[PDB]
Design a protein around this nucleic acid. Sequence first.
RNA 1: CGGAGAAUGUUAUGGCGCGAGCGCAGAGAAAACCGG
Lengths: 176, 188
Amino acid sequence: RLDKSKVINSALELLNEVGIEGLTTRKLAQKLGVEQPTLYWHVKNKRALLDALAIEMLDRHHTHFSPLEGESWQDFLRNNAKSFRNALLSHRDGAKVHLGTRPTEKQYETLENQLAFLTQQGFSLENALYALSAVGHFTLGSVLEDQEHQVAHQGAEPAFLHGLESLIRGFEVQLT
Amino acid sequence: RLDKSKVINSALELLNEVGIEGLTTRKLAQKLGVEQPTLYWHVKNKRALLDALAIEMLDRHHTHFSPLEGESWQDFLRNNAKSFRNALLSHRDGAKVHLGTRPTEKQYETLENQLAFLTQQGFSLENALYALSAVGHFTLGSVLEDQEHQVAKEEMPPLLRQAIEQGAEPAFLHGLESLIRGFEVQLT
RNA sequence: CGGAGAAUGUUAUGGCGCGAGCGCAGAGAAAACCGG
């Protein structure tokens, strides 16, 4: 009948059409061909819908949350930022959708596993959390301004890549 | 007796009370004790009000937009970021208010003076725009998550629980240092 | 008090209730309608 699969697939399509500000559960119910009380069992309001959209965009496109076999910490942080940025760009206003959500327990566990990997490579526990925070804040900030100006030099990927590189070589220095 | 000075002063007080999501020109009109048609002459909608609020917090708190006498480019970028961050934190949801406003002509001129200062100090024109953009994106991202976090204070793994033992300023300062110490490398 | 988490509408120079004035409300509105 009507599973979480069609709910979120239709919700992500309507997010692209309308954006985060005009997206309503009523437009999703009409797009799905269901009454609003029926949809309330799968999504209870806009806040719950945005929470689900952000989680789904990460599971779909944030694939490089863990280091690969024999991958340097520099390459890991590099591809962790690119993966996170791809999720935010997977859909319209994806960074705005992500900013309004609260992290699940699985994301905290994933973050602890990242601190473990960084501390294993010579990072202090304090510096390992700062490196991950800085990369996240920079990536989120870059996409937020990029998607805000996407309503209208050009090309935000070079700015992101050169800034991510500035972070990585800065991390290398502060190790010594 | 309703001038632009009292409008934004009341508006920023109202921003702290209700936040960016609950801020409306009608609640501003009610706080000012005027009918909505009267307030329309000074601010035309929420978008115009947010544009004014973002500019006002910068003029008030973004004071270190220019290098001091004999101040290194490292110290300038450091204190330019700290000054910019102070503006975003000056009021509730200040980073969200800033995000979505379009730069005026004076900040383009102010920004040109910043590329000028950086290009003099050895930066390539290309690298000067990358350094300033990265510092801006990092500062904006840090305050956005920081201000989003202290709203969630209406309500975990131990190694993560060992790092939490407390605010966002230490993370901001160290991350800002990672950028600058990285900029030093990319010059050579 | 209930149909009802109704409709419509979004972020308000307007919409609405009472009657210049007082009052209501925002995507889990204010109105309007039906029922005891």
